[PDB]
Specification:
2 copies of one chain form a homodimer. With 224 residues, chain A is mostly helical. The longest helix of chain A is centred in the last third of the chain and has 31 residues. Helices cover 73% and strands 2% of the residues of chain A. Chain A has one domain. Chain A contains 8 helices and 1 strand, in the order H-H-H-H-H-E-H-H-H. The interface between A and B is medium-sized, with 35 and 35 residues. Strand 1 of chain A pairs antiparallel with strand 1 of chain B. Chains A, B: It comes from Homo sapiens (Human).
Chain lengths: 224, 224
């Protein structure tokens, strides 16, 4: 097919503009019957939800916005890629979802990574001291520990923030592996848009990459 | 200056070959008097230590090897970049050290990332349950927690593994920021070698990039 590259608007709108545009696209997805046509419009809306979250950061928290669209991405992928009847378009659509989900998880981590590095040093120091203080020393030789409530909650949130990265790495490798089955399609998309970089591509780079991919999918799916 | 690109040997030697070559270069660094000439040879040895660690992975653990050369990288940077008399070569040498330290930290994380994702789910589940079980419920309304020793040590190691990534991200951004002060030098190095990718560049890619950079530094420093 003849490939065309989207011309992207340089205007930066407000979060409400993108949020209202995201809701209209999701409503279009809800009305549709076909799972692929639904999933395309769901990912289209997902891109607009990401734009609204990015608008929040450019204005002055995007964390709830990004978390809730991660949830929508998960629901979106359940519409189709592991199925035996899964088509090459389903796999391509899944790769685009995985790229968004991965980079969104990485953003969720980065928004609270200042907390993570402090907590890491404090937790490491307090865990070694609470373990030593719980175990009675035995001269001539050298089951439940108690910790402060503050250290407990610091541990809980530290696990939560670092988990977001753990998911970002795993989902990124998953996208990297699955694209091997559609190497030609995504080598072309990478050629036109430049490839997404895990630690370097900003939300706008991701938004345009995904929309350009959706453009080609609708062209192959003969949709509007 | 006229830039030349190193021709890299395609032979893959054993860990002992690279380890013995790394020790000889470090001994050369120890004998030298000049801090810059020492630091160049220290980073040269660091590259060979990395090659020995990579040889261990290609053979069949590289974790001690990589951790100990991270330590050598830290000592190496203390020889010079924040100093007021710091030259453009010191800053360039520091960027190369930071690239190695960052990617080595990321490798240290990746070697034990299977433990991290399991521990994340278990810790999250057990922390919420131990916190609820410690706090007495109060009908009509809806300081130190105790945890098993196994959950304690699982938390301790989970912090240790995820920390390695926290350092990798922070040191990578530090390298990214500092190269802005030497944008021309590293735009050229990136052009000849291809740019290092945080989550994608393997150890061999990093080894050659660093050695190519050291080549240019010795050329500008008029050293052998």
């Amino acid at each position: 097919p003849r490939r065309t590259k989207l011309v992207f608007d340089d205007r930066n709108y407000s979060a409400d503009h993108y949020l209202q545009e995201a809701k209209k696209l999701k409503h279009n997805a809800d009305a549709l019957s076909d799972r692929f046509e639904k999933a395309v419009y769901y990912l289209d809306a997902v891109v607009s939800f990401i734009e609204c979250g990015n608008a929040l950061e450019k204005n002055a928290s995007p964390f709830p916005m990004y978390s809730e669209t991660v949830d929508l991405i998960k629901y979106t992928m359940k519409l189709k890629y592991l199925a035996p009847d899964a088509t090459a378009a389903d796999k391509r659509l899944t790769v685009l979802c995985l790229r968004c989900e991965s980079l969104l998880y990485l953003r969720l981590f980065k928004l609270k990574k200042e907390n993570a590095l402090k907590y890491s040093k404090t937790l490491t120091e307090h865990l070694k001291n609470s373990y030593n203080n719980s175990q009675a020393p035995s001269p001539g030789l050298g089951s439940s520990v108690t910790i402060p409530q503050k250290i407990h909650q610091m541990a809980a949130s530290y696990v939560q923030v670092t988990s977001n990265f753990l998911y970002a790495t795993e989902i990124w490798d998953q996208a990297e592996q699955l694209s091997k089955e559609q190497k030609e399609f995504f080598a072309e998309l990478d050629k036109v848009m430049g490839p997404l970089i895990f630690n370097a591509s900003i939300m706008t780079d991701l938004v345009r990459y995904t929309r350009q991919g959706l453009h080609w999918l609708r062209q192959d799916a003969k949709l509007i």
